[PDB]
Amino acid sequence: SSDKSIIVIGMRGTGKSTLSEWLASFLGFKMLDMDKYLEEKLGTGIKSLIKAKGWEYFRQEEAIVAKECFTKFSKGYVLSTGGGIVEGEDARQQLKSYADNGGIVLHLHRDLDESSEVQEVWLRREKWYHECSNYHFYSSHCSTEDEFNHLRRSFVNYIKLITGAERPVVPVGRSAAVVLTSPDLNEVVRDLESITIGADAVELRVDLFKDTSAEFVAAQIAVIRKHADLPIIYTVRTMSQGGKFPDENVDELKSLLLLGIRLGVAYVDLQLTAPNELIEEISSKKGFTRVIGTYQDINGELKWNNVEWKNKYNQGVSMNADIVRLVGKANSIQDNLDLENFKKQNTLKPLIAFNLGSQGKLSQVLNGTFTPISHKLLPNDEGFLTIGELNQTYFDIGGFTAKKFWVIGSPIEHSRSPNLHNAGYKALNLPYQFGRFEATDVDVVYDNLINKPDFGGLAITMPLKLDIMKFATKLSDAAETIGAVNTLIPIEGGYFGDNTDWVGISNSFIRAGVPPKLSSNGLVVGTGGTSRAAIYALHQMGCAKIYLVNRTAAKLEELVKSFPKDYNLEIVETEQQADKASKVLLVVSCIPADKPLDGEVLKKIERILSNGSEQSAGFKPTLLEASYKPRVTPIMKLAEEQYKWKVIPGVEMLVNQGDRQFKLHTGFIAPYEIIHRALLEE
Ligand SMILES: [Cl-]
Ligand SMILES: [Mg+2]
Incomplete structure (x- = not known):
């Protein structure tokens, strides 16, 4: 940083x-x-x-x-x-x-x-x-x-x-990049969230724009950033490599590549055949933008044992490209098997490699890094698979297996976890299914669900969030500190136990306009089931102090003992102390919402809510309600109508903890609009 x-x-x-x-x-x-x-x-x-x-x-x-x-x-x-x-x-x-x-x-x-x-x-x-x-x-x-x-x-x-705090992390597992080939993204602007389902990056084909002026290119990137926070791969493909940008317009190409760096794109594509002075200038000015060095055998007659591929890969290594990309053409299914042997022998850099053509589908299914995918609403002259076709074929060759995931607890009948996760599987065409399992003993859960060949993972709710921790051979730091596990997945040698309840809280705040790290302070009201995860989340966000308000003090005094002292938990003992709580811009309400607010708790809340309007931190003071019902709770009505706070219902916390749960279970980013709609629908 x-x-x-x-x-x-x-x-x-x-x-x-x-x-x-x-x-x-x-x-x-x-x-x-x-x-x-x-x-x-x-x-x-x-x-x-x-x-x-x-x-x-x-x-x-x-x-x-x-x-x-x-x-x-x-x-x-x-x-x-x-x-x-x-x-x-x-x-x-x-x-x-x-x-x-x-x-x-x-x-x-x-x-x-x-x-x-x-x-x-x-x-x-x-x-x-x-x-x-x-x-x-x-x-x-x-x-x-x-x-x-x-x-x-x-x-x-x-x-x-651009500050050098953190480069884009190159995906280590399987990953995919949806190739944006539209001449003007305003033609599919309302479809972009659906177009990016299953993608870990978007690859922007600048050369396919109807206008390659700097102003048009920058507006196109603006359209993306309003509909996807995925990292951008910025590509100006020249005519000699199957694209539309003229190879002789070298100054204009350099200017467009430098424009990508100025716009802070995560990756810029460089063609290994480009003039070396262009390559070296971009690489020396890339800053923290990563480089993909790309060569494509357009005529498609090279075999994967040809020396040209070795020379090209070694050029990518010698230029310190972050990723090397080699694209052949398959004139037989053996071309894909030859490529696998090439992948096995060149592992110094991450490598995107596949064969184009209908006979090359196998190589695109087996490719590990940033596999190019398309969508029915985009031009697709190269013939890339959609996310659903890619996931269909991967299952059909044994890359996926039919896994089973479950939510466990008591009661369990009204859980909306299956609706969330099954809608995500459907949109990604994953061969998974999510069920519920009423249980009070974690041992019957292990015999019926965990110790099964098709066990995919668990979502854990009351009353088993601590009992399940005995099956975790690796515990998340948040699971240890909060002392509860709501997600269990199989791993090598055992099971990983995590807690996504706190992730649901902070992402609810982030999605409401709060920066993911901040300097202000937080408040937790009550001692409900998610009060521990609320504290952990507020500390993760950088709150210097976390105030506590409750009816009884004994519960709060034990709360301070159960967290590390550097969390700076402070009990609000009086109404006067509430009036002098400094820089409180985040509130998580963990009190029962069936009854109205009263007593010293209400008076302390009113003073803190009243102080939120003038702090100039760049975002509205924001309150998150933890209760799922009712949708609008008394503390929500007060903070919003009387003190003009930003207000978040408990259902948002549920979607966002499931969102993280979906990534832990499947490895895929959940399609957010679809899973949000699936949990809300009655
Ligand atoms: Cl529990
Ligand atoms: Mg070939």
């Missing part, structure tokens, strides 16, 4: 102050509004200063503030510049110098509800914004909560990439 401050530039939206605050909350940085910094230093508002002292004077003082901030606050700050800072060449050179010295100058582009004066300040400034920044991100306009979640998650991965 980089400690260097981030400078944000770009046109002023009425909420780009919020975005810089949000980013600061995520990074643990301080937010510095450079406009207010100038206004407080000079003792006057910016508007009054301009009309009284002139534009030239204002830009001089703006440049002076920039010079101080860029060196005095060069560590641990989000420096939010005034929108017009790029109007002065003094400030422009300071921005360029900051990026030249290894800093991030981030151009946050906004739609501004896409008074013609705005479009036209934009026309005058747009080139300046580009030249003064080394990174660009579209803060697009979203119309649904799911679009907002995709954009923010895309933003998080982007920030983690």
Whole structure:
């Protein structure tokens, strides 16, 4: 993780102050509004200063503030510049110098509800914004909560990439990449969530766009980031490699590849036949974007024992590509078996390798890394399999086996876990099925379900969340700390016991606009079944303090003893202490919701809810209700209507803990829209 401050530039939206605050909350940085910094230093508002002292004077003082901030606050700050800072060449050179010295100058582009004066300040400034920044991100306009979640998650991965905090992790298991081949993604915009079912990345074929200008390419990536937080593989396939981009337009190719890096794509594709100066420049400027070095035998006459494949693979190793990709053509089914022997002999780098053609299907089914898949709504001239066909054939050759998964507990009749997981299996065409099993003894569960040849995994609910832990040979850290297991899967030598209850809580917050890491504090109300997972989740999110409110203190005093001291659990003993609880922006209610709030508990809650409105952390104060019924609980009604908190019903926690459970059971990312709908449907 980089400690260097981030400078944000770009046109002023009425909420780009919020975005810089949000980013600061995520990074643990301080937010510095450079406009207010100038206004407080000079003792006057910016508007009054301009009309009284002139534009030239204002830009001089703006440049002076920039010079101080860029060196005095060069560590641990989000420096939010005034929108017009790029109007002065003094400030422009300071921005360029900051990026030249290894800093991030981030151009946050906004739609501004896409008074013609705005479009036209934009026309005058747009080139300046580009030249003064080394990174660009579209803060697009979203119309649904799911679009907002995709954009923010895309933003998080982007920030983690460009700051060097965390590179995209190359998949170790089987993985797939849906190949986006549309000339304009706006034609399938409402289908993108379904198109990406089963994919671990999206491969963007830039050369297939109807327009390859930088503006069109950037808008296409914006469309994706509103509908998928999957990592992007950015590909400009040339004509000599089966694509549409002319091989002779080398400067234009380099510019597009550099544009991908500036947009923080997870992977950029490089053709091994490209001029080596182009390859070396991109690789030396890739930063933390990963490189896939690709060669394709277009005429398809090479055999997999040909020396050309060895030379190409070794070129990929010698250029330190993160992934090598070699694509042949199958003129017989033996071409796929020859390729398997090649895969066995070249393991220094991760390798994407398969044969094209109807006779090459076997190689695409057996491929391990980022297997290209398509979708009925996309052009598919290369003839890739859909996720369902890929999973169908893999089962039919023995790659999958008919596994059985179960939810266990008592009572179990009204569990919605089977509906969630079976809908996920259906959409992925997995040969799995999910059932329920009423039980009070974990030993009858082991004899009937676990110790069976087709045992896939367990979902565990009351009253067996501790009794099941005796069968786990490997325990998750969260399972140990919370002291309960709700997911059991077979592994080598035994079984893995995990707890996804806390994952359901934090992802509920994240999906509601909360950054996945923050600096503010949290509150847990009550001692319900998910109160332990709530504490663990709040600590995972980075809450410096976790306050506790309850009717009885003895339950809370034992709660503090049962967690590590560095969790900073603090009991709210009085109403006065509730009024002075600092920076409480997250609340998990774990109290019974069948009765109304009353007593000292209500008075403590009201004071904390009242203090949530003015903290400027970049997101609304957010309350998560743990109770599944009723949908709107008294604490929810109070926080939302009286104090204007953001409010999350308990059903969201259920979907999100099942979402994580689905990944642990199957290894696949669950299709979120489908499993969310399946748990809600009555
Ligand atoms: Cl339990
Ligand atoms: Mg061949």
